[PDB]
Amino acid sequence: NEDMPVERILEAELAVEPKTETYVEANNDPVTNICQAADKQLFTLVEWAKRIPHFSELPLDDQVILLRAGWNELLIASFSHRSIAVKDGILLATGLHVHRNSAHSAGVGAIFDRVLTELVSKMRDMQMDKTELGCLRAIVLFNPDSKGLSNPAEVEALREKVYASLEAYCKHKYPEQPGRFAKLLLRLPALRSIGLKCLEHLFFFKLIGDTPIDTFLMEMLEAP
C-alpha cells in the first residue's frame, strides 16, 4: 500500500464524516430533506476526492468527469454504511433519521428498500469497516469506463492500485475470511443498479418542479 495507502483512504473517510452533534441537534417533506442532504454532501464529496491519493494529480477535466460519473453511487455508499449504526432507516448527513414508513408514504419505498436490503443489511452483516468502505468508494471514483477521460489508462492504473491495497488489507485484517475481498467487490453491481434507479427518481422530482433542489445538486442533474 505504498502508492495507494489504505491509511490515507481511511483518513479521507473520517475527514468528511458527519459529526455526532449534528444528529443530537434534532431528535417535514422526506424527499425535500433527503435532497437537501444530497446537496450538502456533494460539497464534502469534492473534499473527500481531493484526499484520495493521486486524484488531484489527474487533469482537472478528468477529475470533473469522474465526480460527475460517480457522485450518485459514491453518496449512496456513504449513507448506506453510515446507517448500519441504526436498526432501521437511513441517517442523513443533516442529522435527520428517515424511517421506512416515511419513505413509503413519500412514494419512494421500493428504492429505499433496495438500499436497506442490498447495501445496508449486507454491510452490517459482514461488519464492513470504514477502511473497506473507503476503498470501495475509491474504486467507484476511479472509473476508467467514464466517457471523455483524457487519460483512462491512468484512472485504470489508480483503480488497480486501490483494489490491490484493499485485498492486502483484507488478507491481513481478516485472515480467517478468504472470500471477504470478493464479497466486498460483489456489492458494486448492486450499487450501480441502485444508483441508476435513484437518478431516475431525481430526474422525476426535478421534472415535476415540486421539490426544492439546491444549486450543486441541480448542476449535477443538468447535462454537461
Binding site: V46, K50, L60, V64, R68, T215, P224
Partner: peptide, 11 residues
C-alpha cells in the same frame, strides 16, 4: 460547464 464543481476542484 459545471461552474460549481470546477470552482471547488480548482480552489
Amino acid at each position: 460547464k459545471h461552474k460549481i464543481l470546477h470552482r471547488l476542484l480548482q480552489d
